[PDB]
Design a protein around this ligand. Structure first.
Ligand code: CO
Ligand code: ZN
Ligand code: ZN
Ligand code: ZN
Ligand code: ZN
Ligand code: ZN
Ligand code: ZN
Lengths: 225, 225
């Protein structure tokens, strides 16, 4: 689930922080337009950091694994037996009788591709990356982040009073958390009814955190300024 | 690099968005205290979503892989040969001569632990998770996020004028991006001089995005309100 995981980690970040930041700013008697200006500035700034962060990790792991793929094939050139010795240990660790693993290395020495592929598959994990899924990763997380952050900001666009709009945003995102919480469970091995309530509580813990932090800095101001 | 990856993905998120959100709010002639109230509300709301998001994924993957570990051992009980057939394909795909893979399954049938461990190691990846590193993951990403978001907000705490404080925050975080950009390269296979400039440009793209988004909503207001 490459593209399924990318759109899940992107919506959970964009549903919780922009909603929490909005609710916290609305709690401190800020104008609804001000709540929108910091939310959208967060949503835009958030999608780029999530997006390029998903592209930096994907493009770094894709370049490294392909370089180690080349670094390991050059090792079997200079000292072939040392590379054979490393692949022999892989077989040996899993309890193979010596009269059966011996002919395996002899066949592996003639054809390099299969021996290295399995050895690398058994030593450094599945490290051959899809070139199109590296950039597909970044566009899917940035889309899911923008979509997630837009949901808590919709009511502030139609309600110019923030203390009135935050009530529409609490129930709308709470519904969004429970819906996209049970969605992450229908496409996961866990129970979707458990993932719905968990995505709504992380939105509650974060919205409460941003609320308490918003009011502790406004503790000395008479109005929001 | 379990704990090394957790503190990298956490600082890159917390260095870019709180800085960008702050710079965008400061650009629209907002009070420096207002910039702090939305930044810290974002930093707090951001660390919880990053933290519990790292704990939800870790605790879901740890529970699922252990359940599939149990689901697969019960499969070798009802129809042992079907489970043998699945492990036989693993060997067969990598070009094994038939006179050598045959005795391997016979030895694998007597002792279940090694046969399933390798088969699972070769089929469903390395899926046995450390119990202490699942919760260690969440505390390390939340720490790195808070630390990252605090850096762009320090100057606004000592400079009550935002248009004056944003200049101190641009060079301070840009330095932070270049420092923690070359830090992610000294502990990665890529060149650290390349990762420094890349973490500073993602901070530039995001800070510019939040700036343009902050001013497009304030396009009709005479002062920031
Ligand atoms: Co984030
Ligand atoms: Zn090597
Ligand atoms: Zn080797
Ligand atoms: Zn080697
Ligand atoms: Zn199975
Ligand atoms: Zn099987
Ligand atoms: Zn099976």
């Amino acid at each position: 689930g490459e593209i399924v995981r990318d759109i899940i980690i992107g919506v959970s970040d964009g549903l919780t922080v922009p909603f929490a930041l909005a609710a916290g700013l609305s709690g401190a008697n800020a104008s609804s337009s001000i709540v929108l200006t910091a939310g959208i500035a967060e949503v835009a700034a958030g999608a780029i950091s999530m997006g390029l962060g998903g592209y930096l990790a994907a493009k770094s792991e894709a370049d490294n694994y392909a370089r180690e793929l080349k670094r390991e094939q050059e090792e079997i050139i200079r000292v072939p037996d040392t590379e054979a010795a490393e692949v022999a240990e892989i077989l040996a660790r899993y309890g193979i009788e010596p009269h059966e693993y011996g002919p395996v290395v002899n066949a592996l020495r003639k054809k390099p591709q299969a021996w290295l592929d399995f050895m690398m598959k058994f030593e450094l994990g599945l490290e051959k990356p899809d070139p199109k899924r590296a950039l597909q990763s970044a566009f899917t997380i940035a889309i899911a982040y923008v979509l997630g952050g837009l949901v808590p900001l919709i009511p502030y666009m139609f309600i110019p009073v923030a203390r009135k709009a935050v009530v529409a945003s609490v129930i709308l995102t709470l519904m969004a958390l429970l819906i996209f919480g049970y969605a992450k469970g229908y496409f996961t091995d866990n129970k979707p009814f458990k993932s719905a309530l968990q995505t709504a509580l992380i939105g509650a813990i974060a919205s409460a955190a941003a609320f308490g932090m918003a009011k502790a800095v406004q503790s000395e101001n008479l109005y929001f300024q």
